[PDB]
């Protein structure tokens, strides 16, 4: 092997140019798709808001126009996935990981129109789901579209071009290029065998996709938190406790998402008309709470600057938390197109801030700021549920830019992923792909 | 293979408790070792300064005690490596990469005393070498020492504990925990086969190793650069040009270090006394240049804040660059224990600023600051020479804390690693392991 190694080492990082050029193309198209998806959801965001203004006197009428406007848009998303692209429901990240292990087909001719237009209705109606889901699976499918259009083949051309499209999709969804690459290597690569995902090609596609997102989004950040305080060494133990809380809640939440998928199926048994009429009922549910209590609904990026700055009362923080976990399951486990990734950032910050407020008034000698435990908890449920802690920590840091909190963010992230394992939890994305490949091959 | 897939996924990240606990102890000892190594070289550095003032009368005597104090310290380090630990010369990263592919032994009973005390002489005498080299190889061997002390076994226990020790070693050398983990993930894991390096265990050891160095160094940063300006979209093309320049220089520099290893060897042919007397001549050169022109010598971290702030003339930048390229080759290719990693950060920013200074006065409409291209070039020689671009940019960002430059830093990194590939270069660390594994066979 000594001889085989010597000529592997002297022949390393030599990605074929054909792949790198096509990595540039997929990232460009993923960026344009992600921007267009973002502007669309926002356009529906105020179309629906401007409707709330020709109706703002008749309080019954307005809670009516809120439900219906969001119910229809939701029903438009549930329908478009159940009738033309069943694997475009839910997140789509695990379906894209199945493809990378050659275990799921990527039907780009169907998933690209379905999840794009389906997600527009689901996210534009104000349900608690994230853009990450759509943009990664959309971005992956575009990787296979250009993988077919120019008929490149070879195992890597299939695997890389599909990987860079997925990374470009995560990057463009958060304006986080570093997190996009880390997600592929840490979570979305085939994780029990060697593969040829060319990292240099993933780099190319990520930059082009987020350059396109900065052509249409600069000067405004998704989340602005200011510069928080530093974390003294004698305070780190408090972040280890916070991770421990996240570490045991992580799996419990994982059982809920899975179990609620089952419970939600039995109400509709599976045929398309009962299903989409229940998607309209919770789609109208969240469009109503979207303004009777906005923090309960939506993607949740709105509350995070508010929660970090300690501008929420502790009573409300638990309300928002217990409301938002209810809202989160019933929207994601329903099968609606949209991610769970971003909603769990919101839940992480709300739980962090509550722990921080308690810490601030048991230890005045620590001179604490609740926000630092908001930032540390932001990525903690990602670490406990998804168990991609390195992505979670670099994503949170890319979006909040408080590098001085790297150790507390690292410690509660590892505390979360430590107790999630020792309490019998599983990576959510792997646990649902497993259940998807289990019933297809067991009860076929 | 769906049958094995479904329950491989259902068992993912199941790191044995024994490995993660012992990962914590490895990182604790790597941190303490790195701290002691850092304080030791600092103590010798000013011992040499305090000598220079009891000799500030006779300028000839003053250049004499500078040369010989560094010559003796250098000769000491060359001796202990050729006499007791031949694989503790140079960087030590390639040897730890061999060990992770089970193709080089980790003789911890010999290199840990040699590399520690040997590096103390080379770095304490003011040679152009980085502490990362020592700290990574020291940390890896410490990983196997407690592997052996408690004689745990399994492939993963050996590979993990050896990986976390190396990651803890890089983290403690730069106060960069994220880069330590990324370095294992991107560059030093076995790159042509699957392994089960447990990432969460690497995480644990990095945390404890980074806690240990901030117990003895808080409130002071290795390099503080301030907050620089942002990078407008219409200026990004300039960073790609800068990367292209690094991409052409990267391999050219890689050939020089390798070729200088050969040229320097013929001077001593292989003999321990002849070798150690040339190491004293290169050690005395740098202790002398250490007082006739400090920018020519030393690790180079001091000059990085100065260069970024545009406080050097273009003339001085060109002097420093070619001087430091000579001094860097003459110390690393000689076989002295010490890294090449940190010196190429110095070379990267100094050329970065030079490119910055020309750009600012060719495009006054861009309102540029030379420092932003200093930050982008900092990790660029790493990207072109080492071709671990994701570590370089996350490490540079960990040390400079100007996230607003991530896109230009990313663009200059990939332009470097693209043109290094297209001009027929190879990753330096892999090229040194290759030549090491080649002569371990050509002797048969």
């Amino acid at each position, epitope marked *: 092997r000594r001889r085989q190694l010597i000529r592997q080492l002297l022949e390393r990082d030599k990605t074929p140019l054909a792949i790198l050029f096509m990595a540039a193309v997929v990232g460009t198209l993923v960026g344009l798709a992600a921007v267009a998806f973002d502007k669309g959801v926002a356009w529906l965001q105020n179309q629906r808001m401007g409707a709330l203004v020709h109706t703002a006197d008749n309080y019954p009428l307005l809670l009516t126009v809120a439900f219906l406007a969001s119910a229809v848009l939701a029903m438009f998303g549930y329908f478009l996935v159940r009738k033309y692209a069943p694997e475009a429901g839910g997140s789509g990240i695990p379906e894209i990981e199945g493809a990378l292990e050659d275990q799921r087909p990527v039907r780009w001719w169907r998933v690209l129109p379905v999840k794009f237009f389906g997600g527009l209705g689901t996210l534009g109606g104000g349900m608690v789901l994230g853009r990450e889901g759509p943009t990664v699976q959309i971005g992956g499918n575009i990787g296979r579209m250009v993988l077919d259009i120019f008929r490149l083949k070879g195992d890597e051309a299939r695997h890389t071009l599909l990987a860079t499209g997925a990374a470009a999709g995560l990057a463009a969804a958060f304006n986080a290029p570093a997190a996009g690459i880390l997600f592929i290597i840490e979570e979305m690569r085939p994780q029990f065998r060697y593969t040829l995902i060319s990292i240099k090609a993933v780099f190319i596609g990520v930059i082009m996709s987020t350059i396109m997102y900065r052509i249409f989004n600069c000067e405004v950040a998704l989340i602005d938190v200011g510069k928080l305080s530093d974390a003294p*060494l004698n305070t780190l133990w408090l972040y280890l406790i916070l991770g421990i809380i996240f570490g045991i809640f992580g799996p419990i939440f994982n059982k809920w998402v899975l179990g609620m998928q089952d419970l939600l199926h039995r109400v509709h048994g599976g045929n398309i008309t009962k299903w989409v009429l229940m998607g309209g009922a919770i789609g109208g549910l969240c469009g109503l709470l979207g303004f009777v209590a906005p923090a309960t609904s939506g993607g949740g990026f709105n509350l995070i600057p508010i929660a970090t700055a300690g501008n929420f009362s502790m009573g409300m923080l638990v309300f928002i938390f217990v409301a938002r976990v209810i809202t989160t399951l019933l929207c994601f486990s329903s099968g609606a197109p949209g991610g769970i990734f971003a909603p769990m950032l919101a839940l992480g910050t709300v739980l962090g801030t509550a722990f921080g407020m308690v810490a*601030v008034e048991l230890f005045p*000698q620590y001179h604490l700021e609740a926000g630092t435990f908001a930032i540390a908890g932001m990525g903690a449920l990602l670490a406990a549920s998804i168990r991609a802690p390195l992505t979670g920590i670099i994503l949170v840091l890319e979006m909040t830019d408080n590098y001085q909190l790297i150790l507390p963010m690292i410690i509660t992230g590892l505390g979360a992923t430590l107790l999630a394992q020792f309490t019998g939890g599983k990576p959510l994305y792997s646990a649902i792909l497993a259940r998807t490949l289990a019933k297809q091959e067991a009860e076929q | 293979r769906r049958r094995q897939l479904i329950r491989q996924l259902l068992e993912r990240d199941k790191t044995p408790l024994a490995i993660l606990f012992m990962a914590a102890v490895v990182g604790t000892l790597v941190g303490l070792a790195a701290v002691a190594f850092d304080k030791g070289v600092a103590w010798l550095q000013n011992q040499r300064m305090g000598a220079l003032v009891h000799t500030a009368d006779n300028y000839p005597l003053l250049l004499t005690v500078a040369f010989l104090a560094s010559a003796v310290l250098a000769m000491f380090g060359y001796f202990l490596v050729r006499k007791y630990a031949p694989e503790a010369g140079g960087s030590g990263i390639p040897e730890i990469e061999g060990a992770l592919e089970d193709q080089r032994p980790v003789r911890w009973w010999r290199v840990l005393p040699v590399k520690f005390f040997g590096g103390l002489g080379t770095l304490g005498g003011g040679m152009v070498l980085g502490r990362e080299g020592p700290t990574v190889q020291i940390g890896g061997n410490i990983g196997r020492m407690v592997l052996d002390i408690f004689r745990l076994k399994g492939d993963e226990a050996r590979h993990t504990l050896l990986a976390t020790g190396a990651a803890a070693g890089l983290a403690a050398a730069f106060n960069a925990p994220a880069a330590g983990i990324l370095f294992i993930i991107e560059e030093m894991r076995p790159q042509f086969r699957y392994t089960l390096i447990s990432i969460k265990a690497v995480f644990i050891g990095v945390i404890m190793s980074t806690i240990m160095y901030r117990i003895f160094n*808080c409130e002071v940063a290795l390099i503080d650069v301030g907050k620089l300006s942002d990078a407008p979209l219409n200026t990004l093309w300039l960073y790609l040009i800068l990367g292209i320049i690094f991409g052409i220089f990267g391999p050219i520099f890689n050939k020089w270090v390798l070729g200088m290893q050969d040229l320097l060897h013929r001077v001593h042919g292989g003999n321990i006394t002849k070798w150690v007397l040339m190491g004293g001549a290169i050690g005395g050169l740098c202790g002398l240049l250490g007082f006739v022109a400090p920018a020519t010598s030393g690790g180079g971290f001091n000059l990085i804040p100065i260069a970024t702030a545009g406080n050097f003339s273009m003339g001085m930048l060109v002097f420093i660059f070619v001087a430091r390229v000579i001094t860097t080759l003459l110390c690393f290719s000689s076989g002295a224990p010490g890294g090449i990693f940190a010196p190429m950060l110095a070379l990267g920013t100094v050329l970065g600023t030079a490119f910055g200074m020309v750009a600012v006065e060719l495009f006054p409409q861009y309102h540029l600051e030379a420092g932003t291209f200093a930050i982008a070039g900092m990790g660029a020689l790493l990207a072109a020479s080492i071709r671990a671009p994701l570590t370089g940019i996350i490490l540079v960002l960990e040390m400079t804390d100007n996230y607003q430059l991530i896109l230009p830093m990313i663009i200059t990194g990939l332009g470097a690693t693209l043109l290094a590939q297209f001009t027929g270069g190879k990753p330096l660390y892999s090229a040194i392991l290759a030549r090491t594994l080649a002569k371990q066979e050509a002797e048969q």
Partner: antibody
Amino acid sequence: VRLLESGGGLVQPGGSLKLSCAASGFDYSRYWMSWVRQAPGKGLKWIGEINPVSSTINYTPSLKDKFIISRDNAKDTLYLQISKVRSEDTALYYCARLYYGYGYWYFDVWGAGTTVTVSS
Amino acid sequence: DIVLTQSPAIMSAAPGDKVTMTCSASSSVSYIHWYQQKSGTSPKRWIYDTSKLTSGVPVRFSGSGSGTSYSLTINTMEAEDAATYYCQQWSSHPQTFGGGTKLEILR
């Protein structure tokens, strides 16, 4: 890096006054500030602290609005108002920037002080 | 409130003597700081975290202790060390100051 306090001097018993501490040479925001006073010929006693955003304001155990501590980061100035002034308030008042090492906070650098004399 | 009681209120010493003053706490405290106040001068941070020297403090100074008993030591005092020294704690809120140890010089 200097802290120069003013506003000191004479107040009639029962009255009130506000001291100011003009900081310079360092980012005044992002720094916890504090007030310490020293009675004539005696030792030091903490008055209170305020965090950079004025969200947290702590005081030594005294009564109603005995002390109120305020800062305006726009002009890097610290404030302290004493009310219902009694003879125990005659002291040299120090304004001090706060910091820490391991996490147990100390009084980093001190101002020159400003005297207040409660007399009629 | 944790009250800290310091060694002698006043002590005399000749330059060259090893001098020790102690800070005793009513309850357990940790990582105590010391402040030097020369006559007519605002207190200046001297020793922090029980044992660390503020930059510029001559290394003839040292601190130690744990639990309820802490001390500051000048190994061979010098005449310029004449001042009043204050120990301070903030391991428990609210922070508190000792009464001060005034150091006088024999000559």
